[model samples]
Target: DLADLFPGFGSEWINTSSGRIFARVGGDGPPLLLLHGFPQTHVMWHRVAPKLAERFKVIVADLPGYGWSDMPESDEQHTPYTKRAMAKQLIEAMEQLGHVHFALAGHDRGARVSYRLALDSPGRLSKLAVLDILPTYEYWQRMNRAYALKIYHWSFLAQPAPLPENLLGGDPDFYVKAKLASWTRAGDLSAFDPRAVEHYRIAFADPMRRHVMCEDFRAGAYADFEHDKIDVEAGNKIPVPMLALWGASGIAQSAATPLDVWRKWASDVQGAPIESGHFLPEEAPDQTAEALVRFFS
Candidate 1:
């Protein structure tokens, strides 16, 4: 039924060494990979991807250990949940699906993955768009009084092993609901579909999956910074045209120095604030889609 929403798109299950990747593929011309944020899956792009499908083949994937994808077999294998590793896994999966080069756009966690894709295989990416995130390093460095207070989880979840995983498993639903409720506007709970909220609750219901998520943030705390440092030192700026979009009311709101921060990693950049919250795709799909298409065109 969901596939019917987008006429051209078709669903496929592609198995890779990492795990089976559930993806929706269709459209025409250069490939575009759409990655979703935390507590959500590729389905988040259901509304917007179709719009792009008319011009581009949109491939939406549920990252390993999130959504419908299989959770990592062990905590160590869960290390792949980190952006860099996940980027590699996605590339390998795409290669298996017959893609050697493609464009990418990611929201939240996907943004991190897109960055790593550009870092690890810069030439392979034709274009990139990052929705609502700063370079993780910049986020950490500029984390001052207000940012530190608002984005507390950046530190809390980043804590190593057992601690965050144990605390999160104590009450997963509460954490999920709290995250959704707190991040959204007042009386705007309707902005998020109840089914989607429950989907996150279900995915995180497994403690192993919850731990994998914590491990993702843990990698961000330690290894991700080092990886980013290497990219920076290598003078790595994405070779393709890049766009950075952020919600005016989102976490990176104040810290974003406009295209200045983006220029650090993207040689050619264009972006501006959109009127929405963190869930820009759901809240403002038309505007979001328009911006993306206009930039890419």
Candidate 2:
């Protein structure tokens, strides 16, 4: 069903030490890897990926615990879902495909993984781009009343395991739709393709997937933040050229300056706002794709 969204793409599963990852590979030219955000899958790139395929071989994959990817059981420390582990999974998958180096871009949760990969394996990425997010450490430092109200799910989902998993499971569809609606500028679901939305609903409805999603957030709040803090203390910065794209009207823009915040974490950082909301690839596919192609080139 969701596979139909990518007409020319080939779907396959890659086994990494972490777990199995589902991905779609297509197009030609230099390799480019695309990662999706929360409450959605690689299908979020349905509009932008095909267009990007014109210039680069696009590899879009669901993060370890999201979409069709295997849900590895979580531990007390949530290491399996930490962005570091997730980053390793993608890196291994790319190496298995014979790509020692490539351009990388990620939305939401995927962006977290991308930045971690860039920091951990500096030589592996030639160009890096992140969609609609601030660093985990900065996000915690900058949290405020307005931001808290806007993104209550950060804490709600990060709460001890079974709590979020149980509450969200009460009505997975309603919670998923609410999240998409609330995060967008329009405060509605019109920007998303109907088929993609349905795919997300089906994925979230699964109880195991729901728990995995919770583990992802738990890692973000604790382990991921700790890693970021350590990097900051050591003055370790993202080594490759970086692009930081965010929705003009998204909470990220409203909360803090995107490029300014990234400069603190990365040595070579540059970006601006796209004329869309949080879901840039879906709402402003052409602009999102054009910027990525130019930056990655």
Candidate 3:
């Protein structure tokens, strides 16, 4: 049973515009929304959620089309997969769960949406923490040959539909396993729990999930960047306290100065690097939880 990913947590499906978003809620204080990254699900928070639950009413959710969440249709522009759309529904989900204002901490893709939410709806987020990523806008802007090679998936997955879908569709578990392991400092699957790996493997095995997953990258390559560009041009900042946590050897650290990159997108920001790799919550749960508790406190 692995004792259940979130043993003492309550599971619920939040009916937002994105459909019934799957989430695990527990703990007993101010609300804290934790969103997972690409190729992963709410299960990413299993190790860290309980610790934060000691001081937070933690809600860890699977992004739309990930894990058990509904797969809504995507427009030609991939509007539904855009971070804007993702953020809007997350806010509604929070409100429906009896929280209008809350703190958010997201790792990888979820971190992208957290900042988007902070900027798009300035009043809803009390504090924001982005884990292991710079802005999507910044990523494209700074891409070079070497860096592109490291983050090849950004472009590869963003290619026109059916390209990555068909390629990655071959043995989803291998793709998931390879990507997840390579991104971590350990360069192996030793850091992740088997229960969590099963969730990831099962999600990617579905072709529909992989298609929408590509749409997420498509949105990231275009619409998400377009939104960030506009905000950057208009000098729109996060308008809230921000924390930038990254793995010491994570993707964000390799790009540029994490805090410096974040400072341009947010007015008030601070962060530090964990001793682990990309999957902070999974690889370094104690450090990840402690950092979140301090920042969101």
Candidate 4:
């Protein structure tokens, strides 16, 4: 299915502690790893990645529990699904692919993992770029009525199991469509490719994945939040140069000034807003790709 969506990209399954991860590797040059966000797969990069591949060796990977990747069984702490855990596995997987150090980029949940990777394994990254998200610590610290309204799913999905699963998994199709529509600036799916949309729908349609999806958010609220909490107290920040790109009308913009918030997490960071909504890679592929090329090149 994604073979068409990710033209000329080669599929590879890499073994991870959780299980095997499904990733597509293409292009030929400096290695660049791209991670997709929540409620979507690596297919989210379908539009922007090909252009990026023209200049760099691009690897778009499905985060654990999303897309075709393995879903590690649920844990009470959601430990296995934490951003730290995901970052550890991804870095090791990249090692297996002969990428000892690589530029990294991610969106949404994937962006959470990318920043975690930078914090947990700084030397392993040549550069780091996060698309459309602040840190977990920032999210919880700033969770107010207005912010909560924009990202209500944070609390809803992160609720205990069966609560979110039963309600959302009951009709995954409608849930995914509705969430995507509400997040995008266009207020609809017009910005997304139809086939890519199906890949997302199919991923959520799976009952196993449906539960893992909730675990992802559960980890966000519990395990992942703690990780971010201590780091700020210790005055820790990402050492590598960073780039933060968000949609002008996307979720991050509604938060504090994204660039200002990002400065608290990393030094040597600079960015500009893309002209689209939350799904910058899909809605404004050219602009997203161009910015990434300029940064990573």
Candidate 5:
């Protein structure tokens, strides 16, 4: 059903060491990977990817544990859900597609993965763009009452697995819709397509999916921070050119200057705020697409 979102794009279920990755690939230029955020899938790119496909071989994939991708069992360290592992899986999949180097753009959780990928495999990425997020370490360091209230799900989902899983599983639709509504500027679900919303609701309705979602946040809170700190300590910075976009009316802008924060971690960085909420790609597709094309071109 979601295939209709991609128009003429071809689909693939790529097998990596981590697990099988469900992806939609189309167009024919330099390879470009589009990664989605939490509680959603590659379908998050439905509005932006097709337009990008006109000039780039856009590869949009659901992150591991989300959408059609396989959810690996949790570990003591939540390693399976860490951005390191997630980045590796995507890298391997791209290699399998014969793309040793490509541009990458990710929003939210996917942005975390792109951040890690650019740092871990500096030469593999030609350019990078991160939407609506700061580094995991920066986020944790700057947590305050305002942030805590607005982004309560970070803590709620990161709590010990079963706790969050059991709670959200009770009424996954409500939880998903609430999240979408709360994070957007309009404080409503009007920004999303009805079909896309339904797909998200269906994917998240499963109990295992709910549990993996918590594991993902748990990994973000713990394992991802550990990796980010180690890199920061080692003077490791993203060597590739970077673009950092945020929503002018979203939590990120309220919390910190995204470009300023990113400059500390990347040598070459440029970005501005989109006049929308957290879901820039969906909320402001034309502007988002124009910004990305200019940066990646």
Candidate 6:
């Protein structure tokens, strides 16, 4: 019943200088690229993408080091996992696919990548949406003792070298499942389908994948900030419409207040908190899809 939504959809393997990426493309009209968050991949949008595909060409990709995409060779060469670099690769992949301008939406890590895309290659993105994340600078600036203590992983995962990699590699599946469970308020693992969670588990089982994840956080807390800072100092404003959706029960629950923050970069901004958990797309596809549809319309 569900697969029927993507009637003519087909999947492709996009090869880039950094690594190979797996993507699904279908539908018609303006293209809408969907990105997923940490510990998950494009599979997170399996339920949501089809709905959007009814009206738009939806492209879903497995970000590097997660899902079907190629994992970086090692932690030593982990720079590509950085949001800016990943965004650049994604743009290249889209261009290779013949997309000149498109709308983009991301959840979690995907949102992080989307922000960098807006800042780095503004011309390529027609419209932008970030689900459940504060601007990296704002997140770092406002992180207090209490906030830091609660979201310790923000700093813990950002550590350099093998420390972070070793810790996560010890048992990546347990760590990822625990992180997902703890991040959700309802403690409802039911939000994720068993098959989906198994996929995530398999992705985490690979050491290379673990390395890329650690590198992503490390870059976010380090090099990625430089890009964010540059955009801030330049007084960059996203000329296209922007939508920011936060899950009420998720860490970005304070989304409304960031409307002013978004205004710093986007000429037009709309934001609201959805009544759900960290896994917004998977947990609340109907509501989340509606927000996306309404915003894009």
Which regions in candidate 6 have their CA more than 4 angstroms from the true location?
A: 1-8, 73-78, 252-256
Q: State the lDDT of candidate 1 residue by residue for 102-144, as single tens digits.
A: 8889998889989888878887788899988888887777778
Off by over 4 Å in 4: 1-3, 252-256
Global lDDT of each candidate:
0.78, 0.89, 0.88, 0.88, 0.89, 0.81
Shift in Å, residue 143, candidate 5: 1.3
- Which predicted model would earn the best lDDT? 2
- With candidate 6 superimposed using the best TM-score fit, by how many Å does residue 280's alpha carbon deviate from the native? 1.0
The collision pairs in model 1 are none
**RMSD list, candidates in order:** 2.4, 1.2, 1.4, 1.3, 1.3, 2.7
TM-score attained by model 2: 0.97
* Preferred candidate (TM-score higher): 2 or 6: 2
User: What's the distance in Å from true for residue 191, model 6?
Assistant: 0.9
Evaluate candidate 1 by giving its C-alpha RMSD to the native, one decimal: 2.4
- lDDT of model number 4: 0.88
What RMSD value applies to candidate 6? 2.7
lDDT of 6: 0.81
TM-score of each candidate?
A: 0.91, 0.97, 0.97, 0.97, 0.97, 0.92
Per-residue lDDT for 239-266 in model 6, tens only?
A: 7679988777876444436566777768
Stretches off by above 4 angstroms in model 2 are 1-3, 252-256
**Where does candidate 3 stray beyond 4 Å?**
1-3, 252-256
lDDT of 3 by residue, 41-159 (tens): 89999998888899999999988778888988998899888999999988888989899899999988899889999988978989899998899998898888877998899999999
Tens-digit lDDT track for model 5 on 86-174?
99988888889999899999999999999999988988899999998899998887778877877788898999857887787668899
- On TM-score, the stronger of 1 and 6 is 6
